[PDB]
Structure formats: C-alpha cells, structure tokens
C-alpha cells in the first residue's frame, strides 16, 4: 500500500495474540507499545523522546504481524502516549518514504 | 527521491537563511526545530511526545526549503533533541509511505 500523510499513518497489528493499532513512525529508531503482554525474559532499557526519557522493557525476537505482514524483532514495552512501529520493523516490511 | 529506513531519514533544509538538518518524521503532526532564528510575532504552545512535554514558540507561514522543495507553513521552535519535519510539511512536498 501507499499511505499519504494527511492523517496519521496508523495500522492494525497483531502481537502476543492481541490486536492493537500503532503509528508508522519514521522518527523512531525502535518500536514502543503499551499494554501488550509479551511472554518471558526481558532487559530494562530507557528511551528518549521530545520531552524526556521513559523506562521500558526490551523483548527480543517478538513475532508481530503488521498490516498483514509477518515480521520478528525487538519490541519495547512501556509508557507512551501512543503505540509506535519504528524503523527496526519498518525495514522488515520494506517500508520507504517517497517524494 | 525514495528513502529507505535502514538509517534515519535525515534531510538538509534552509529556513530563515540558515542551513539545518532535520529528520523526516511520520510520527510528528508538527515540525519542530531548535536554534533557528525566525522573525516576527509568535504564539506560545506546548507539544507532547514520549517522555513528556515541551514549551515551544509557534510561527505561522514560515518559508522553508526541504531537500530543494519550497513550502510554507507552521514551524515550532523549542527544545527538541533533534530537528523534526512533521506531517504538516511532509504533505506539502508530496511525501508518502510505501510498502
């Protein structure tokens, strides 16, 4: 699909057997979700945005289906005003900017 | 051009006669820069991101050339960790996400 930018580029994902929506975010290196629950071990991490830093759990090799495309990568779980898919997953689906 | 997401989608801009780099950010509604000197009147605004919220100046109708494409629109000036081109300007240059 081609997605224009007149509205926020939001897509439906499935992760951990649950359905969420999330913003395709070229401004984000990493993928950050809240209130998903992933199984197993994680590592504590801190991520930074516009107004400061937050603590997140880092999970590796998490299966995520992103607008009907199956991918595996790192998923960070923590406080965020909104769910974000970052470049680490976007490259996996072959997502580009075009102008 | 087409820009893949294996690294940060950073472009060169000219704004108010100064040259800057900025990150093409589908996750930002608005365009936020630091250390730019815009002329004239402006209104205080607060923007939010991950980590919390930042006080900014809002300037309307600011010419800005973004990868050699001339557009006009709202530019926010305030403490950001990186300069961001938002969707408000990206739609003006015809920028889309493709996968």
């Amino acid at each position: 699909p081609q997605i224009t930018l007149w509205k926020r580029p939001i897509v439906t994902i499935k992760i951990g057997g649950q359905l969420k929506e999330a913003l395709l975010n070229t401004g984000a290196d990493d993928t950050v979700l809240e209130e998903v629950n992933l199984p197993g071990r994680w590592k504590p991490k801190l991520i930074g945005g516009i107004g400061g830093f937050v603590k997140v759990r880092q999970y590796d090799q998490v299966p995520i289906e992103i607008c009907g495309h199956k991918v595996i990568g790192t998923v960070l779980v923590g406080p965020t005003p909104t769910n974000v898919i970052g470049r680490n997953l976007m490259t996996q689906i072959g997502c580009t900017l075009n102008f | 051009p087409q820009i893949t997401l294996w690294k940060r989608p950073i472009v060169t801009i000219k704004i108010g006669g100064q040259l800057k780099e900025a990150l093409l950010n589908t996750g930002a509604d608005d365009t936020v820069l630091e250390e730019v000197n815009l002329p004239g009147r402006w209104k205080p605004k607060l923007i939010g991101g991950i980590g919390g919220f930042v006080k900014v100046r809002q300037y309307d109708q600011v010419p800005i050339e973004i990868c050699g494409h001339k557009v006009i629109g709202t530019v926010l000036v305030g403490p950001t960790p990186t300069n961001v081109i938002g969707r408000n300007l990206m739609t003006q240059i015809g920028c889309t996400l493709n996968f």
Partner: peptide, 6 residues
C-alpha cells in the same frame, strides 16, 4: 503530537 531514540 511529536513521537524516539536511545
């Protein structure tokens, strides 16, 4: 409004 690194 304006979305991350480190």
């Amino acid at each position: 409004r304006v979305x991350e690194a480190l």
